[PDB]
Design an enzyme around this catalytic site. Structure first.
Site, PDB file in Angstrom:
ATOM      1  CB  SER A   1      40.354  22.437  69.946  1.00  0.00           C
ATOM      2  OG  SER A   1      39.132  22.737  70.603  1.00  0.00           O
TER       3      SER A   1
ATOM      4  CG  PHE B   1      43.572  36.888  59.711  1.00  0.00           C
ATOM      5  CD1 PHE B   1      42.390  37.608  59.762  1.00  0.00           C
ATOM      6  CD2 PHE B   1      44.590  37.336  58.880  1.00  0.00           C
ATOM      7  CE1 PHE B   1      42.240  38.786  59.042  1.00  0.00           C
ATOM      8  CE2 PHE B   1      44.448  38.506  58.149  1.00  0.00           C
ATOM      9  CZ  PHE B   1      43.268  39.228  58.237  1.00  0.00           C
TER      10      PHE B   1
ATOM     11  CG  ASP C   1      35.947  43.692  64.990  1.00  0.00           C
ATOM     12  OD1 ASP C   1      37.075  43.203  65.225  1.00  0.00           O
ATOM     13  OD2 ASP C   1      35.192  44.043  65.919  1.00  0.00           O
TER      14      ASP C   1
ATOM     15  CD  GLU D   1      38.301  38.686  58.924  1.00  0.00           C
ATOM     16  OE1 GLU D   1      38.694  37.890  59.797  1.00  0.00           O
ATOM     17  OE2 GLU D   1      37.552  39.652  59.197  1.00  0.00           O
TER      18      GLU D   1
ATOM     19  CG  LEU E   1      41.912  44.761  65.842  1.00  0.00           C
ATOM     20  CD1 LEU E   1      40.496  45.263  66.020  1.00  0.00           C
ATOM     21  CD2 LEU E   1      42.229  43.671  66.861  1.00  0.00           C
TER      22      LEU E   1
END
Ligand code: NA
Ligand code: NA
Ligand code: NA
Length: 162
Positions: free
Chosen positions: A117, A104, A20, A11, A32
Site C-alpha cells: 500500500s 495513531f 477500545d 476516536e 490506549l
C-alpha cells in the site's frame, strides 16, 4: 478540517477508562493505556501518564493533553521510520493527515508493514492504493473508519469527514 479534528471524529472523547474496538483499556481521545486485561494495570498507566492518582477518570483538559502528545508521537514515529518517512514526505497535507491517522490507530510498526500500500501511495496510484488498503485486518475490523481514511487517501479531500 485538520488532523486533530479528524482524529476527534474517529476516536470520540470519553473521560473514564473504557475498552477500545480491540477490547483494550483506553481513555480520552483514543489514548490506549495498555493491552493488559488488568484494569489495575490500566489505571497505573493512566496515573503515570497524567502525573497524579486518577482512579480512572480524567478531565477534558487532561484528555486533550494526552491527545496532543499522541498526535505528536504519531508524526514523530512516521519521521523516524525509514519506511514511513519517504511516503509521508511524498504526500500532500490532506493525505499526510490520513497517514498520521493510521499510525495513531495502529502504531508506527503496524503501518510501516503495509509495504505494498505504501508503495502505491508513493506512486500516487490513489485508486489502486485504496483497493489495496482495504485488503487488511484493519479495514475488516474497523470498516467505517478505514473507509473514511481510505477515501482521504483516494481523493486528497476531506469529503469523508464533512
Ligand atoms: Na490490490
Ligand atoms: Na469502524
Ligand atoms: Na465520502
Amino acid at each position: 478540517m485538520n488532523i486533530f479534528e479528524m482524529l476527534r471524529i474517529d476516536e470520540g472523547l470519553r473521560l473514564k477508562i473504557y475498552k477500545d474496538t480491540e477490547g483494550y483499556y483506553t481513555i480520552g481521545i483514543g489514548h490506549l493505556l495498555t493491552k493488559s486485561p488488568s484494569l489495575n494495570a490500566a489505571k497505573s498507566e493512566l496515573d503515570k501518564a497524567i502525573g497524579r492518582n486518577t482512579n480512572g477518570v480524567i478531565t477534558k483538559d487532561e484528555a486533550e493533553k494526552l491527545f496532543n502528545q499522541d498526535v505528536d508521537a504519531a508524526v514523530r514515529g512516521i519521521l523516524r521510520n525509514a519506511k514511513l518517512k519517504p511516503v509521508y514526505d511524498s504526500l500532500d497535507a490532506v493525505r499526510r493527515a490520513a497517514l498520521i491517522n493510521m499510525v495513531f490507530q495502529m502504531g508506527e510498526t503496524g503501518v510501516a508493514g503495509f509495504t505494498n500500500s505504501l508503495r502505491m501511495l508513493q506512486q500516487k496510484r490513489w485508486d489502486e492504493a485504496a483497493v489495496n488498503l482495504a485488503k487488511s485486518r484493519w479495514y475488516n475490523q474497523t470498516p467505517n473508519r478505514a473507509k473514511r481514511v481510505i477515501t482521504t487517501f483516494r481523493t486528497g479531500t476531506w469529503d469523508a469527514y464533512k
